[PDB]
Design a protein around this ligand. Sequence first.
Ligand SMILES: [Mg+2]
Ligand SMILES: [Mg+2]
Ligand SMILES: [Mg+2]
Ligand SMILES: [Mg+2]
Ligand SMILES: [Mg+2]
Ligand SMILES: [Mg+2]
Ligand SMILES: [Mg+2]
Ligand SMILES: [Mg+2]
Ligand SMILES: [Mg+2]
Ligand SMILES: [Mg+2]
Ligand SMILES: [Mg+2]
Ligand SMILES: [Mg+2]
Ligand SMILES: [Mg+2]
Ligand SMILES: [Mg+2]
Ligand SMILES: [Mg+2]
Ligand SMILES: [Mg+2]
Ligand SMILES: [Mg+2]
Ligand SMILES: [Mg+2]
Ligand SMILES: [Mg+2]
Ligand SMILES: [Mg+2]
Ligand SMILES: [Mg+2]
Ligand SMILES: [Mg+2]
Ligand SMILES: [Mg+2]
Ligand SMILES: [Mg+2]
Ligand SMILES: [Mg+2]
Lengths: 104, 88, 66, 70, 272, 117
Amino acid sequence: MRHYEIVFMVHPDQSEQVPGMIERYTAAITGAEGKIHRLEDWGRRQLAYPINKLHKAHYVLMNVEAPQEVIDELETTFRFNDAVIRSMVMRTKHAVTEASPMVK
Amino acid sequence: SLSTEATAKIVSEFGRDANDTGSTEVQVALLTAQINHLQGHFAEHKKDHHSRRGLLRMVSQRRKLLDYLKRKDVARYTQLIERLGLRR
Amino acid sequence: FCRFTAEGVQEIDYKDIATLKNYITESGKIVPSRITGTRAKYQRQLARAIKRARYLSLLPYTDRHQ
Amino acid sequence: PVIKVRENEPFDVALRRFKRSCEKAGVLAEVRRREFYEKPTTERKRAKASAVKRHAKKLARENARRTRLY
Amino acid sequence: AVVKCKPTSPGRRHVVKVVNPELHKGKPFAPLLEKNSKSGGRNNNGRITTRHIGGGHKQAYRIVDFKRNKDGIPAVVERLEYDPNRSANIALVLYKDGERRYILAPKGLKAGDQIQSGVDAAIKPGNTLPMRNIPVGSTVHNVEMKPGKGGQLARSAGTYVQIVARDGAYVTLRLRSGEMRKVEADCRATLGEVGNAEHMLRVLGKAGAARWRGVRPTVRGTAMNPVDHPHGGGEGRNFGKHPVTPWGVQTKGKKTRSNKRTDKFIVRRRSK
Amino acid sequence: RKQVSDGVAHIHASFNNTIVTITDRQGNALGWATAGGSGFRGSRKSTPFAAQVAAERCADAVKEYGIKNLEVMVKGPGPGRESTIRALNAAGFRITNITDVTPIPHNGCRPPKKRRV
RNA sequence: CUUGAGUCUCGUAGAGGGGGGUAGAAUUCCAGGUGUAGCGGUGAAAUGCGUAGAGAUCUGGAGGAAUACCGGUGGCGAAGGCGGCCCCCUGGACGAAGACUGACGCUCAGGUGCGAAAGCGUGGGGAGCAAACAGGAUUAGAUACCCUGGUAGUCCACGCCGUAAACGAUGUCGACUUGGAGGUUGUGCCCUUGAGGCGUGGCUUCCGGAGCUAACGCGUUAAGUCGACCGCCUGGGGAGUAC
Ligand SMILES: [Mg+2]
Ligand SMILES: [Mg+2]
Ligand SMILES: [Mg+2]
Ligand SMILES: [Mg+2]
Ligand SMILES: [Mg+2]
Ligand SMILES: [Mg+2]
Ligand SMILES: [Mg+2]
Ligand SMILES: [Mg+2]
Ligand SMILES: [Mg+2]
Ligand SMILES: [Mg+2]
Ligand SMILES: [Mg+2]
Ligand SMILES: [Mg+2]
Ligand SMILES: [Mg+2]
Ligand SMILES: [Mg+2]
Ligand SMILES: [Mg+2]
Ligand SMILES: [Mg+2]
Ligand SMILES: [Mg+2]
Ligand SMILES: [Mg+2]
Ligand SMILES: [Mg+2]
Ligand SMILES: [Mg+2]
Ligand SMILES: [Mg+2]
Ligand SMILES: [Mg+2]
Ligand SMILES: [Mg+2]
Ligand SMILES: [Mg+2]
Ligand SMILES: [Mg+2]
């Protein structure tokens, strides 16, 4: 199992849908025997440059140990869900559980 | 590349001892397994010439080793190539 | 001066926008290693981090109005 | 090279900051270089020449110019 | 695969077959067949209304499902088949409730594959969903023009359409001709490109092949006598005329679209 | 007829020519002037002085609108790039912000070939 | 037998290769707003574009190609070559301690593979650039240089071609022979007291001793002292041409 690190930015008008979404993604990972090493809702945040003409995207961070098939499925879900503006699944070597600088 | 556990299993199978890694038979077996594994990759990626260079090197090493076995000990050579199902 | 020397930084983090802002100029461009004094390995790591942040709109690509 | 003129900043002073900012950014140099396509070989050759000249000049100054000129 | 036939005769030397071994070597599903007698390009007055049509092979008509209305019930692709009535290949599918149906085969599609029409249907090749549901940018085929009418656009081999935009009730389609066209977003559209893409790589190799496909020989207007064609015929090979159809209307470059009812839907006319 | 008080001066300063364009803060152009129209051709319109008189002309043109504050956006490598802003200030606007917006690609389209002179 | 050669364990750095996504800047085009006589170009002009509203400026859209800064006589690769970010597949190099095999090695005529750019075939794509081509200049002429345009091509898939000043103008492998200053990447000890002290490997740049060289220069990455094998040369032209 490969340690990943997903960060996805959500449309701020759909910020209320975010708790359910987090639950769904985590649930899928667990269902597929995926561990969840850190989970940080960073919330609404000011973009450094306007994406799709809209500012203030809602950032969610998720460091996960999962299989790659499930990572692929998650990526596909991200791409087709017209809610997540950006995503960034990024491989990591170890269990990076400590809290991130943005929460710090 | 070949995973650690798989490599260990190969070593145990053909290795006189589980700390034996240099034995000719073990070396040949490891090369063969690697080559077999890489077949799928090269079927997918026919233009991966650099990687195929690596594969070719593996093949050459196996041939050289096999030849060494043939001259040294014929029975071992015959048994090994029957076990592995390698032509000549 | 090479900030990471006191740590011997274990790994540069693209989310650490606080420090990456030391390694980007006013216009958003990456500062040369010769000017900031970063070690070469670390400089490469930082550049990668900056690029990732830019992708995630944590840092800006350029100093323009928005 | 964005500049905003501060309260009670003279215009000439503002201009000076703007010019300095532009020079630091290196906008004019970038544009001039990107005016025409330099071939990759040309770019490599120029880089090599620059490196050689710089090194040679530095060596000459520091080590060769440690003697009595008069 | 494409296969160059060896030159054992001057009839085979230029032939290029497109051979697909995945097709069904067998008889088609008899409930979906029906009679399809030939016209010879003649209308109900018995007159030749389209030249150069005649003869060829007998052909049963497969009843292909362009409407794609079994919403929700998931089907599975049993087998790919040869359809003589179209460039594309068809696919015999089996709906969970027991109904079988022919559909156009999309790209990559094969036996045992699972497909589903509907709104909830997953975005994957061979699935069919209203074009408001399909992501903008997606390549689609068998596209409907009037909601519920049945796919009309991009039915031919390797064809497809780009959903370039969705503004309200209309999606903008970049059609295979290059044409941009507004279509209602309620119009159905099957994901992916239509299969047998190598169809165009085939080379008939002889006159007989065309004949087998029912295409009778074309006679050049300039071969004819002045009474027969506006290109008449002179002593030797003269021409001196501006090119024209047999019925005397300039050919090559003169536009003929006469349709003010539908111009509102044409966002940009094709180019090149 | 309208008044705006605060404009943007877009100084397009190519090697051959200087275009000055005063606009409302939104983007809509009020008046423009060039060294070419200012009465300079060739060697004379590719100079700082020409740019300055172009700037003066532009200021005069937009005098109707009664523009008081002005932010200047300089573009391109040019002989003016300074003369125009100096002239504008002299003509008597408060220069609030000065920004460079020269469009550098991030290694994009291929430039035209090198001149052999 | 274990010193050459290889295997296993753990790490390390890397534009190494193949496939698939994606980001921002910029050019072009398209539609619209503002707006008015110029723009463009050059040594100076003209062709060209613009009162049928261009250039400038703001908004939106399309599409292709390439990845600013970082960036380095930096790195990787047998060479050709490789440069945004992300994932999937994948080859090699290097260090640490051990353990294992036990000369399994070096080189290689034929042979086989890889091999920039241009070029070719078939099917796509086509923004920018640009052989050919067109017009404008310059000129004695100007089938050029300069200017405005501009098609193959440059891009993608899969085949072919099989060559370059494909150069370090320096065949591969191994051993030995004074130094200095760097770069890069490991690793051992020293309290890292700080970025730091003393070692020990790999690759790499410059300078220089002996020696070598016709000289220029090379100089522990040799063009020095040697061993193995290969490739190649024997005056200029004719000619890397004819058959
Ligand atoms: Mg006909
Ligand atoms: Mg014909
Ligand atoms: Mg005919
Ligand atoms: Mg006749
Ligand atoms: Mg007639
Ligand atoms: Mg005739
Ligand atoms: Mg005749
Ligand atoms: Mg005649
Ligand atoms: Mg005639
Ligand atoms: Mg030019
Ligand atoms: Mg790498
Ligand atoms: Mg290496
Ligand atoms: Mg040979
Ligand atoms: Mg090429
Ligand atoms: Mg071609
Ligand atoms: Mg072509
Ligand atoms: Mg051009
Ligand atoms: Mg030209
Ligand atoms: Mg040669
Ligand atoms: Mg070369
Ligand atoms: Mg040579
Ligand atoms: Mg060799
Ligand atoms: Mg030397
Ligand atoms: Mg002779
Ligand atoms: Mg010859």
